[PDB]
Amino acid sequence: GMESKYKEILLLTGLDNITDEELDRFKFFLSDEFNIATGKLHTANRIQVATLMIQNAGAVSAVMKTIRIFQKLNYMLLAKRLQEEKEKVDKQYKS
Amino acid sequence: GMESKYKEILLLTGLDNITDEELDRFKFFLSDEFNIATGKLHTANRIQVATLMIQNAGAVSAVMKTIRIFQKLNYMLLAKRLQEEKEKVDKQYKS
Amino acid sequence: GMESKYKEILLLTGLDNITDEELDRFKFFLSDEFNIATGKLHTANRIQVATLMIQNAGAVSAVMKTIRIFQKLNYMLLAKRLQEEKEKVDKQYKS
Amino acid sequence: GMESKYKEILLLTGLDNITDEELDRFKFFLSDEFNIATGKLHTANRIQVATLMIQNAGAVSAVMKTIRIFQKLNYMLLAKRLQEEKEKVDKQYKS
Amino acid sequence: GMESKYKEILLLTGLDNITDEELDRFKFFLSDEFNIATGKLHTANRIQVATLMIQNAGAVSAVMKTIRIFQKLNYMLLAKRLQEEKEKVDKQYKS
Amino acid sequence: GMESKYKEILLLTGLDNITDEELDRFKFFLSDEFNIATGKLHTANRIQVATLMIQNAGAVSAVMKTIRIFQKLNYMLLAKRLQEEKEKVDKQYKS
Amino acid sequence: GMESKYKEILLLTGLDNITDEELDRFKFFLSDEFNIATGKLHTANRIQVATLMIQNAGAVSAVMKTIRIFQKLNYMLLAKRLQEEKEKVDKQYKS
Amino acid sequence: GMESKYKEILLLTGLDNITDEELDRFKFFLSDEFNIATGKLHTANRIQVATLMIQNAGAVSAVMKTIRIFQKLNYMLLAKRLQEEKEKVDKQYKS
Amino acid sequence: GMESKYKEILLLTGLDNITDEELDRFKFFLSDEFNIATGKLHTANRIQVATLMIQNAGAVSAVMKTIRIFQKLNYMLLAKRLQEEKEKVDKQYKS
Amino acid sequence: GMESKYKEILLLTGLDNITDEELDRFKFFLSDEFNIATGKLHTANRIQVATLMIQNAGAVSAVMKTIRIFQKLNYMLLAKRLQEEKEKVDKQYKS
Amino acid sequence: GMESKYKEILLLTGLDNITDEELDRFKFFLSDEFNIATGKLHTANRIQVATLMIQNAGAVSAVMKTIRIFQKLNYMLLAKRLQEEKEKVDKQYKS
Amino acid sequence: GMESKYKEILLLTGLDNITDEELDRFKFFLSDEFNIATGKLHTANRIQVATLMIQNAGAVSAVMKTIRIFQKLNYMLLAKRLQEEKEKVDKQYKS
Amino acid sequence: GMESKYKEILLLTGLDNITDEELDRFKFFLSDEFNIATGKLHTANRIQVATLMIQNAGAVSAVMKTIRIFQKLNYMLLAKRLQEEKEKVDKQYKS
Amino acid sequence: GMESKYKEILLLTGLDNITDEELDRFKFFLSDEFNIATGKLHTANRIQVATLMIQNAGAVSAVMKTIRIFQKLNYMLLAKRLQEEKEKVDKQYKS
Amino acid sequence: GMESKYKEILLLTGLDNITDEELDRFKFFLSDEFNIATGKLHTANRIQVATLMIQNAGAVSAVMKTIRIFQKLNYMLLAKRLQEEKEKVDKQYKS
Amino acid sequence: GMESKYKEILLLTGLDNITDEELDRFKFFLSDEFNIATGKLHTANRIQVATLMIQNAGAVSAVMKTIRIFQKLNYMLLAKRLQEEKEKVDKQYKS
Amino acid sequence: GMESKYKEILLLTGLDNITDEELDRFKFFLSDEFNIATGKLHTANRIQVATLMIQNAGAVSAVMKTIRIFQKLNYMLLAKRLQEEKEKVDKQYKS
Amino acid sequence: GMESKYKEILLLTGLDNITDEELDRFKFFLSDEFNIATGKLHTANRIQVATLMIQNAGAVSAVMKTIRIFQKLNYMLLAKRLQEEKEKVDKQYKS
Amino acid sequence: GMESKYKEILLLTGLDNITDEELDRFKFFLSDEFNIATGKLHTANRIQVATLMIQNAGAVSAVMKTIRIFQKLNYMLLAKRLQEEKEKVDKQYKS
Amino acid sequence: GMESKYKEILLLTGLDNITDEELDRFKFFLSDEFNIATGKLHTANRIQVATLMIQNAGAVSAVMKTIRIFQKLNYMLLAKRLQEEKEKVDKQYKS
Amino acid sequence: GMESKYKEILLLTGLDNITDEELDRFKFFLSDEFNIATGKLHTANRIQVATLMIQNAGAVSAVMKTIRIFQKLNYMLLAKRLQEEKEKVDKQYKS
DSSP states (O other): OOHHHHHIIIIIIIIGGGGHHHHHHHHTTTTSSSOOOOTTTOOOOOOHHHHHHHHHHHHHHHHHHHHHHHHTHHHHHHHHHHHHHHHHHHHHHOO | HHHHHHHHIIIIIIIGGGGGGHHHHHHHTTTTTTTTOTTOOOOOOOHHHHHHEEEEEEEOHHHHHHHHHHTTTHHHHHHHHHHHHHHHHHHHHHH | HHHHHIIIIIIIGGGGGHHHHHHHHHTTTTTTTTTTTTTTTOOOOHHHHHHHHHHHHHHHHHHHHHHHHHTTTHHHHHHHHHHHHHHHHHHHHHH | HHHHHHIIIIIIGGGGSOHHHHHHHHHHHTTTOOOOOOTTTTTHHHHHHHHHHHHHHHHHHHHHHHHHHEEEEOOHHHHHHHHHHHHHHHHHOOO | HHHHHHIIIIIIIIIGGSHHHHHHHHHHTTTTTTTTTEEEEEEEEOHHHHHHHHHHHHHHHHHHHHHHHHTTTTTTHHHHHHHHHHHHHHHHOOO | OOOHHHIIIIHHHGGGGGGGHHHHHHHTTTTTTTTTTTTTTTTTHHHHHHHHHHHHHHHHHHHHHHHHHHHHHHHOOOOOOOOHHHHHHHHOOOO | OOHHHHHHHIIIGGGGGGGGHHHHHHHHTTTSSSOOOOTTTTTTOOOHHHHHHHHHHHHHHHHHHHHHHHHHOOOOOHHHHHHHHHHHHHHHHOO | OHHHHHHHHIIIIIIGGSOHHHHHHHHHTTTTOOOOOOTTTTTTTTTHHHHHHHHHHHHHHHHHHHHHHHHHTTTHHHHHHHHHHHHHHHHHHOO | OOHHHHOOOOOOOIIIOEEEEEHHHHHHHTTTTTTOOTTTTTTTOOHHHHHHHHHOHHHHHHHHHHHHHHHTOOOOHHHHHHHHHHHHHHHHHHO | OOHHHHHHHIIIIIIGSSSSSHHHHHHHTTTTTSOOOOOTTTOHHHHHHHHHHHHHOOOOHHHHHHHHHHTTTOHHHHHHHHHHHHHHHHHHOOO | OOOHHHHHIIIIIGGGOOOOOHHHHHHHTTTTEEEEETTHHHOOOOOOOOOOOHHOHHHHHHHHHHHHHHHHTOHHHHHHHHHHHHHHHHHHHOO | HHHHHHIIIIIIIIIIGOHHHHHHHHHHTTTTSOOOOOTTTTOOOOOHHHHHHHHHOOHHHHHHHHHHHHHHHTTTHHHHHHHHHHHHHHHHHOO | HHHHHHHHIIIIGGOOOOOOOOHHHHHHTTTSSOOOTTTEEEEEEEEHHHHHHHHHHHHHHHHHHHHHHHHHTTHHHHHHHHHHHHHHHHOOOHO | HHHHHHHHHIIIIIIGGGGGHHHHHHHHTTTSSOOOOOOTTOOOHHHHHHHHHHHHHHHHHHHHHHHHHHHHHOOOOHHHHHHHHHHHHHHHHHO | HHHHHHHHIIIIIIIIGHHHHHHHHHHTTTTSSSOOOOOTTTTOOHHHHHHHHHHHHHHHHHHHHHHHHHTTOHHHHHHHHHHHHHHHHHHHOOO | OOOHHOOOOIIIIIIGGGGGGHHHHHHTTTTTSSSSTTTTOOOOOHHHHHOOOOOOOOOOHHHHHHHHHHHHHHOHHHHHHHHHHHHHHHHHHOO | HHHHOOOIIIIIIGGGGOHHHHHHHHHHHTTTSOOOOTTTTTTTOOHHHHHHHHHOOHHHHOOOOOOOHHTTTTOOOHHHHHHHHHHHHHHHOOO | HHHHHHHHHIIIIIIOOOOOOHHHHHHHHTTSOOOOOTTTTOOOOEEEEEEEOOOHHHHHHHHHHHHHHHHHHHHHHHHHHHHHHHHHHHHHOOO | HHHHHHHHHIIIGGGSSSSSSHHHHHHHTTTTTTTOTTTTTOOOOOOHHHHHHHHHHHHHHHHHHHHHHHHHTTTTHHHHHHHHHHHHHHHHHHH | HHHHHHHHHIIIIIIGGGGGHHHHHHHHHTTTSSSOTTTTTTOOOHHHHHHHHHHHHHHHHHHHHHHHHHHTTTOOOHHHHHHHHHHHHHHHHOO | OOHHHIIIIIIIIIGEEEEEEHHHHOOOOOOOOTTTTHHHHHHHHHHHHHHHHHHHOOHHHHHHHHHHHHHHHHHHHHHHHHHHHHHHHHHHHOO
C-alpha cells in the first residue's frame, strides 16, 4: 500500500503542481539522478514521467529523488510539501 | 438542467467578464478554494478553468466559490451579478 | 437530400465560421444539448464534432441545436445565418 | 440484468466522459485497486479497460472501485454521477 | 425472402456504417442481448458478427436487437435508419 | 446426466467465453493441474481442450480445476460464473 | 417415405449447414443424447455422423434430438429451420 | 465451349478480383441466391466457391447471379466488368 | 445397344464426375430409391455402385433415378448433363 | 486505358493534393454522392478512398463526382485542375 | 454369462470409446501386459484386438488389464467407467 | 508558370509588405470577396492566408481581388505595386 | 524417348513449379481441355494429374495443352519455360 | 542467370526501397500494367508482389514495367536506380 | 510444484507487467542469455516467450535470467518484484 | 519390466510433450543417431516414431539417444525430465 | 558518395538553417519547382521535406533547386552557403 | 559425421535464426542456386526447406550456398556465423 | 553374393530412404527405364518395386538405373549414396 | 560476449538517448553507411533499427558506424559517450 | 558528476539570469561558437538552448563558450559569476 501512497504523492502532489516549463527543467535534471535515457523523456507528459521514475528507481527513491531535484530547482515549497506528504505516509505505515 | 444554467452563469457571466490579468489573479486564488493542482492552471484559458472548476467541485460550489474568490479580489460588481444570476436560477428551479 | 443539405449547413456555414476558442466554447456547451460523452469531444476538430452531432442527434436537430448553442454563446450573426440557410433548405424541400 | 446496467454505467457514464490524459491517469491508478497487469493496460482504449476491469473484478466492484479511483483523482463530478447512476440501478433491482 | 432482406439491412446498413471502435462498443454490448459467448466475438469482423447474431437469434430479432443496442450507444441516426429500412421491408412483405 | 451438465458448464460457459490469448494462457496452466502432455495441447481448440480435460480428469474435477486455473489467471468473473453454474447443477442433482 | 424425408432433413438441412468447428461441438454433444461410442465419432464427417445417428436412434428421434442438440448449442436459426422442415414432413405424411 | 468461357469469366474476372473480406461478404450473400449449404462455404477459397456455384446452378446463372450479388454489395465496377465479359461471350457464341 | 449407352451415361458421365464425398452422399441416398442393401454399398467404388444400380433396377431406371438422386443433392449441372445425354440416346434409339 | 488515366487523375492530381483535414472533409462528403458505407471510410487513406470510389462508382463518375465534391468544398483550384486533366484525357481518347 | 458381460464391457464400453490414435497407443502398450505377438496387433481393429485379448488372457483379466493399460495412458474417465461396469457385473453375478 | 508568378506576386510583394494589424484588416475584408470561412482565417499567417486565397479562388483572381481589398483599405502604394507586378507578368506571358 | 522427355517436361518443369492453389486452378481448367472426369481430379496430386493428362491425351498434347491452360491462367513465365523445354526436345528429336 | 539478376534488381533495389504507403500506391498501379487480379494483391507483401510480377510478366518486363510504374508515381530516384542496375546487368550479360 | 510457482512468477508477474516495446527490448536481449534462435522470438507473444524460456533453460534459471535481463534494461521495480516473489517461493518450498 | 518402463518414459514423457514442429525437428535429427531410413519417418506419428526407435535400437539406447537428440535441439527441460525418469527407473530396477 | 554529400548539404546546411515560417514559405514554393503533391508537404518536417525532394528529383537537382527556391525567397546568405558547399563537393568528386 | 554437423549448422544456426519474412526472401532466392521446384517451397517451413536443400544439393553445398544466399540478402552477421561454424567443423573433421 | 549386396543397396539404401510421394515420382519414371507394365506398379510398395526392378532388369542394372532415375528427380544426395555403396561393393567383389 | 556488450552500447546508450526527430535524422543517414533498404527503416523503432544495423553490418561496425553517423549529425556528446563505452568494452575483452 | 554540475552552472546560473532580449542576443551569437543550425534555435527556450549547447559541444566547452559569448555581449557580471561557479566545480572535482 505504501507503493500506492507514494504514487499519489509523486503524481498528484509533485508532478501535477509544476508547470510545463518547470516540467522541462525537471526532465532536464532527471538524467543526473536516475540513469534514464532521455530520448523517451523528451516528449513525455507527467504520467509517463512518473511511470519512468517509478519503473526505473522504485516509488520510494522516486519520491525522495523528486524532492532532491525540486531542491536543485530551488522549489522549496513543493519540496517541503513532498516532505510533508512523505512523512505523513511514513508515519502512516512505518509506525 | 440546473447544471447547464450554472455552466452558463460561471462561464458566460463570471469568467468571460474578467480580463486577462484578473484571470491570473483568479488562478492565483483558485488553489486556496478548490484543491486543484496549479500546473495545469498556469496556461489554461477561461474554458479550461471552468472545466477544472466544474470538474473538481461541481457546478453549484463552483459558482458559489467563484463568488467567494471574486469577493476576495474585491470585485463586488461581478460577485453581485453572479449572485443575481444564481438567485434567478435558484428561483427558476428550486421553486 | 435534406440530410446532405443540413450537413452542408452544419459543417460549411456553422462550424467552419467559428474560431478555435469559439469551437472550445461550443464543445463546452455540447454536453448540455446532446448527451454526448465529452472524452472524445475534447480533442475533436470541426469534422469530428459535426460527425458526433449528426450521428448522435440527426442532422435536423443537429443544425437546430447548433442554432440554440450559438444563441447561448450570443453569436447572433451565425445563428441568423444558420436560420437563413435552414429556411432556404426547408423552403427548398418542404415546399 | 444488473450486470448489463453496471456495464452501461461503467462504460457509458464513467469511462466515456474522461479524456485521454485523464484515461492515462486512470490507468496509472488501476494497478493499485485491481491487481491488473499493466502491460496490457498501457495501450488499451476505454472498451478494453472496461473489459479488464469487469473481467478482473466483476461489474459491481468495477463500478465501485471506479468511483474510488475517480475520488483519488479528485473528479468529484464524475464520481457523484456514477454514484447517482449506481444508486438508480440499486434502487431499480435491489428494491 | 424476408431473411435475405434483414441480412442486407443488418450487414449493409447497420454494421457497415459503424466504425471499428463503435464495433468494439457493439461487441461490448452484444453479450447483454444475445447470450453469445464473447470469446469468438473478441476478434470477429462485421461479417462474423452478423453471422453470430443471425445464427444465434434469427434475422428479425437480430435486426431489432441491433436497433436496441444502437439505442443503448445513443446512435439515433443509425437506429432511425435501421427502423426505416426495417419498416420498408415489413411494408414490403407483411403487406 | 451430471456428466452432461458439467460438459455444458465447461465448454459452453467456461471455455467459450475466454479469448484466444486467454486460451493460450489456459493451456499454459493446464500442465500444472492435469498431468496432460502439452504436445497435443499446443494446437488444440476449445473442444479438444475440453475433451482432454474431461478425458484426463473427469468432468467434475475438470470443471473444478477450471475454476482453479481461472482463479490463477485472476479471471474472477468467469470463475464466479462457473461456480454459479456448478452450484446450480449440484443443487439440481445432489438434492 | 418418412424415413427418406427425415434423412433429407437431417443431412441436407441440418448437418450440411453447420461448419467444421460447429460439427466438432455437435460431436462433443452427441454422446449425451444417443449412447454412441465416440471413438468412431472423432474422425467422422457429416455423412457418417448422420449414418450413426439414424442407425443408432432412428430417423425421427435422430432429427428431433438434432433439434435438441442444436438448442443446446444456442443455434436457434437451424433448430427453427429443422422444426419447420420437420413440421412440413409431419404435415405431409401424418395428415 | 460457352461453359468454359463462363468459367473463365466467373473465376478469372469475377472472383479473383475481390479481396478476402469481400469474399466473406460474397459468401455471406451466396445462401440467398443459390440454396447452397453454408457449412462448406465457410472455409472455401475462390476455386471451391466457383465449383459450388457452377455445380449448384450452372455456369450461366452462376455468372448472372454473381452479377446480381455484386450489385447487392454495391460493386458496380466488377458487375459492369462481368456484364462486359458476359456480353462479349454472348456475342461470341449466341451470334 | 441402349443398355450399353445407358451404361456409358451412368458410369462415364454420372458417377465419374462426382467426388468421393459426393459419392458418399450418393450412397447415403441410394437406399431410398433402389431397395439396395447398404452393407455392400458402404465400401463400394463407382464401378460396383453402377453394377448394383444397373443390376438392381435396370439401366433405364438406373440412369433416371440417378438424375433423381442428383436432384435430391442439388447437383443441377450433373442432372442436366445426364438429361442431355439421356435425351441424346433416346433420340438415337427411340427415333 | 481511359480507366488507368482516370485512376492517375483521381489519385495523383485529385486526392494527393488535398491535406489531411481536407481529406476528412472529403470523407465527410463522400456519403452524399456515392452510397459508400462510412465505417470503412473513417480510417482510410487516399489510396483506399480512391479504391472505394472507383470500386463503388467507376472511374469516370468517380473523377466527375470528385470534381463535384471539390466544388462543394469551394476548392475551385483543384476542381479546375481535375477538369483540365479530365478534358485532356477526354481529348486524348474520345477524339 | 459373465464371459459375455465382460465381452460387452471390453468391446462396447472400453475399446469402442477410444479413438484411432488412442487405439494405437493401446496396441503400443498391449505387449507389456499380455505376451501377445505384435505382428498381428499392428493392423488389427477393435474387434480383433478384443479377440486377441480375450483369447490370450481370458475376459476377466482382459478387462482388468484393460483398466490397467487405460490407467497407464492416463485415461481416468474410461478406466473409471470400466471399473463401474465391471463392478456392476461382479455385483450382478458374484452376489 | 503564370500560377507561380502570381504566387510570387501575392505572397512576396503583396502579403509580405503589410504589417500584422494590416493583415488583420485584410482578414477582416477577406470574407466579403472570397467566400472563405473565417474560422481558419482568424489565426492564419501570411502563408496560410495566401494558401486559402489561391486555393479558394485561383491565383489570378486571388491577386486581382488582393488589389481590390488593398484599394478598400486605401493602400494605394501596395495596390499600385501589385498592378505593376501583375502587368509585368501579363506582359511576360500574355504576349 | 520423346514420350519420356515430355514426361519430364510436364511433371518436372510444369506441374512441380505451380503451387497448391495454382494446382487447384489448373484442375479447375483441366475439364475444358481434356474431357477428364473431375471426380478423380478433385483429390489428385501432381503425379496423378500428370498420369491422367498423359493417359487421357498423350504426352505431346498433354504438354501443349498444359501450355494452353497456363496461358489461360496468365502464367506467362511457366508457359514460356514449357515452350523453351518443348522446343529443346523438338529440336532434340525432330531434327 | 539474367533471370536471377533481374530478381535481385526487382526485389532488392526496387521493392525493398519503397515504403508501405508507396507499396500501396504501387499495388494501386499494378493492375494497369500487368493484368494481375487485385484480390491477391490487396494483402501481399513485397515478396509476393515480386512473385506475382515475375510470374505474370517475366523478370525483364517485370523490372521494365516497375521502372514505368515508378515513373508514374514520380519516383525519379528509384526509377533512375533501377535503370542503372538494369543497364549494369544488360552490360553484364548482353555484352 | 516449484515449477508451477516459477511459471506463475515468470508469466504473471514478470512478462505480463512489461509493455509491448519493453517486450521487444526483452526479446532483443533474450539471445544473449539463453541461446534461443531469434527467428521464432521475432513474432512471439508473452506466452510463447515464456514457453521458449522455460523450455530452453528451465523455470528456475528462466526466472533468474529474467531478473538479470530486467536489470540489463534498468527495470529495477520489476526485477525487485521478481526477486520478492522468487524469495517467497524459495521460502515456501526450500524451507 | 525395464523395457516397459522405458517405453512409458519414451512415449509418455518424451515424445508426447513435444509439439508437431518439434516432432519434425526430432525426425530431422533421428537419422544421425539411429541409422533409420527416413522414408517411413516422414509421415510417422509419435507412436510409430517410438516403434521405429525401440525396434531399431532397443529401449535403453532409444531413451538415451532421445535425451541426446533433445540436447541437440536445446530442449534442456525435456532432456532433464527424461534423465529424471530414467534415473528413477534405473534406481527402481538396477538397485 | 556524391549522393551522401548532397544529402548532408541539403539537410544539414540548407533545411536545418531555415526557421519554421521560412520552412512554410519553402513548402509554399516547392510545388513550382518539383511537381510534388502538396498534401503530404503540408505537415512535413525538414527530414520528410528532404526525403520528398531527393526522392522526387534526385539529390543534385534537389540541392540546385533548393538554391533556386532560396533565391526566390531572397535568402542570399543560405543560397551562397549552399553554392559554397555544393562547389566544395563538386571540387571534391568532379575533380 | 560431417553430414550431421552440417545439418546442425544449416538448421540450427542458419535457418532457425531468420524470421518468417526473411524465410520468404530466402525461398525467393532458393530457385537461383539449387534448381529446386518452387511449388513445394511455397508453403514449406524451415525443416522442409532444410530437407529440400540437403536432399537436392548435399549438406556441404547446402550450407555453402546458404552462406551465398545470405550474402545476397545482405545478412552479413548470419553469413559470418555460418562461416564460423562451418570452419569449426572443417577444422574438426578435415584436420 | 554380389546379387545380395545389390539387393541390400537397392532396397535398404535406395528405396527405403525415399518418401511416399517420392516413391510415386519414382514409379512415374520407372516405365521409361525398365519396360515394366505400370498396372502392377500403381499399388506396389517398396519391396514389390524392388522385386519388379531386380526381376525385370537384374540387380546391377537395377541399382544403376535407380541412380539414373534418382538423378532424373534431382536427388543428388541419394544418387551419391547409391554410387558410394555401389562402388564399395564393386571394390568388395570386383577386386 | 563482446556481441552482447556492443548490443547494450548500441541500443541502451546510443539509440535510447536520441529523440524521435533525431531518430528520423539517423534513419535519414543510415542508407549512406549500411546499404540498408529504407522501406523498412521508414517506420522502424529503435529496437528494429538496432536489429537492422547489427543484422546488416555486425555489432562492432554497427557501433562504430553509429559513432560515425552521430558525428555526421554533430552529436559530439553521444559520440563521445559511445566511444567511452566502446573503449571500456575493448579494454574489457581485448585486454 | 562534473557533467551534472556544469548543467546546473549553465542552466541555473547562466541562462536563467539573462532576459528574453538577452536570450535573443545569445542565440544571435550561438552560431559563431557552436556550429549549431539556427532554425531550431529561433524558437527555443532556455532549456532547449542548454540542450543544444550541451548536446552539440559537451558541458565543459558549453559553459566555457557561454562565458565567451557573455564576454562578447559585455556581460561581465554573469561571465564573472560563471567563472566563479566553474572554478568552484573545478576545485570540487579536479582537486
